[PDB]
Amino acid sequence: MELITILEKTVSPDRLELEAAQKFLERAAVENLPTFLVELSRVLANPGNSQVARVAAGLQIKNSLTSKDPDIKAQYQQRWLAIDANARREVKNYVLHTLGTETYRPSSASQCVAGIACAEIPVNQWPELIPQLVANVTNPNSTEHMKESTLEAIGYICQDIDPEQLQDKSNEILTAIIQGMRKEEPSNNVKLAATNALLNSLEFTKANFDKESERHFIMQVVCEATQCPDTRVRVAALQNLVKIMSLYYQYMETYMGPALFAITIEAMKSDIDEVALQGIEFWSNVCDEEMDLAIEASEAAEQGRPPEHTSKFYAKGALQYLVPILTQTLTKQDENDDDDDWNPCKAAGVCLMLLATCCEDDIVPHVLPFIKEHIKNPDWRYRDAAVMAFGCILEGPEPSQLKPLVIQAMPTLIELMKDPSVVVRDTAAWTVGRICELLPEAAINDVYLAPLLQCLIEGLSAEPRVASNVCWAFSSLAEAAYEAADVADDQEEPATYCLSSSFELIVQKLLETTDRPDGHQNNLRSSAYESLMEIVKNSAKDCYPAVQKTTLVIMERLQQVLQMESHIQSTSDRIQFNDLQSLLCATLQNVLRKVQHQDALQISDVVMASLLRMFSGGVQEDALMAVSTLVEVLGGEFLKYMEAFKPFLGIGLKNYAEYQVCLAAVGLVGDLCRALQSNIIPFCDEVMQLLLENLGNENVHRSVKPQILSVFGDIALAIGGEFKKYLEVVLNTLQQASQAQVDKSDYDMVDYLNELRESCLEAYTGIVQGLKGDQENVHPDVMLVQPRVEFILSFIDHIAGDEDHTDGVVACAAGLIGDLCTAFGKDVLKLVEARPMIHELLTEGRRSKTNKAKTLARWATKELRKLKNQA
């Protein structure tokens, strides 16, 4: 059984054959990885081998070096780095030599080079790589395949490694990339590959953009490629401009007027969609960058010091030119429209919205003309475009200024609701919703509020595309008619708003919309239920009775669906069934929080029985969540079901296979803790057993870990002293977690780290508070964790000295410092002050916009003061 033979078998559509080939390769690798890789690389490097054997060889090598799972990736790289340098050198030489010898267009060797480079560049073990790749591209004698394949490897390296790891070789890397992009280069495939590689290399080229001469060379070559006769190269080059504008905003004053404006404007007017999208994306990005600079401005302003970055207001200056192009682009809709399709029309719409929020009022005079001229055009394309434009600028300009405009347009908008074209009504329904959210006064009035409700109600019967948007509109009108029910002169709950008079006619109609032939587009059903959930939540007092009976309808419906298992067959009739159950559970969660407490006690027996029968996969998660809400409403009175529910809750936790349902369960424990308090002690040994098992189970999804650590805090709070038993295991686990470190290069792993850090902070908070007790007398048990105070403070110190953060982490850390003050007292002051970055975290929190971060950081600062002023 030659290796070439086995590799060719990896392409068989035969489950068994496919599995035989796999076991053999998995055994060879397990048996002797070094030789396995060397052997695979030999196969890949021989152009004499079939295309299939070579590609399969490359895939085996690749899968041995990297993984889409960040954790598995690091382990693979460590395993490779542990291989005899001589063996690795031989694999490296074969892969590198394969460049330019592969038939099949997408190169396999290119991916293997990158997988290895990701393990080695960060430890400086492949110094020969960059120069060889650079040489392959800049050698005038090199073939097209050779240059393309090499640029592909460069592109993959730039895409998969922390830019800071390539920073010291940016000069060389750029020489190769800028070389492949030159106008003189013969092959358009090489220019394409080179231009895609530049896009991935922009983050580590700062030192280069800081040099006037290098910056100018890069800009010239990129702008030059936007004029390449090859469309693919034109588009990629335009994307580089989009990114360059975003990363080097402050360096563009020099280029905007003499080149970028012209290039980006032309691109927008292109009949080639892909080109138009880049030109539009370019200006949408400028708006985003300028909006942020304004925020940065007001920031420093209220903070004293002057901003470090200052806007140039490119959006404002280009406004008079952008608007006419965007409004006309809005005219490029079509009968056959796709919602998840990102075309020039949709993009123009978003860009218009960003321009309005970036330039405010300034946009009205430029757009109003377009709107009046086409609001009545017989051509549905222009009529829709006009309505769309109107809706796109409702956010940004001053309300006071827009009120009269919207007020006067209402007659036309209402009529638009009855327009023959489905597209027009779709947009009309959306604009009505926008008005309710931005300029409510225009709708919630004693002249339009009635005809509006009338058309909205009638809209629920229109096509899904419109009915769905009408649901969102209703959803906002209620949210508006509610946000304008209180205030007055006191701080209490509303009583009876403008919809109360028709609150019921609406719930019944949404309930009917909800009863329409499924499979329907634009998720009508989901939208109606969602709308119902919103109108209920946004109901005043005098709505209670209506909400009461709606609660009964949901239950009955939930029960009628249960015994619907009579025609549950064929993957299509059951998918609507699982989502109906899912939609009703989520709905029950909303009315449950709106009815009185007695209503829950008079219904609890019914729901548990129901929710019980239901616990597919997506339904479980929804059932558990429904139970969480019932647990929050029942409170201690839930203890009654704990015996019958015990085995099921344990089920959700034990699984983990479907981390989603597992997460709802963990979340449920936390709710059980808050509802039962100490009464949960008898069930804790079991729950803690499963939770600890999940943690040490390296097969459990990563997003479950922090949810569990955070629950340790809820349990400690609920059981207090009884938590002593687990302290050793829990604190050891927390120390480990707290020391978790991901590559600050990955945004997804970074957010993960923040979530985890926040969860550790909450566990600590729960432990400290739980041991201290809920009285004006710090309980001795707190002292058990007293020798852990420095670690905690130090852990927060490091968190402080980390540009990542998040108001969430800052909030929890502030809360924890304050807890330590109240638990250990005076001595905590020295420890905090001996760690300067903590002080910075508190100041940072007191500035934050997040009320949680501002409240806790402020409360903590106070507690520390009391230690300063106490015996």
Binding site: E530, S582, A586, Q589, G618, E621, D622, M625, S628, T629, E632, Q660, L663, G667, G670, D671, R674, D714, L717, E762, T765, Q769, D774, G815, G818, D819, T822, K852, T855, W859
Partner: peptide, 24 residues
């Protein structure tokens, strides 16, 4: 299925917040 999780979570985190607060 997005709001069913992410939104029901916010409302939960708030449970602890108001809990720790009216205790702190």
């Amino acid at each position: 299925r997005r709001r069913r999780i992410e939104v029901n979570v916010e409302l939960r985190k708030a449970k602890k917040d108001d809990q720790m607060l009216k205790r702190r």
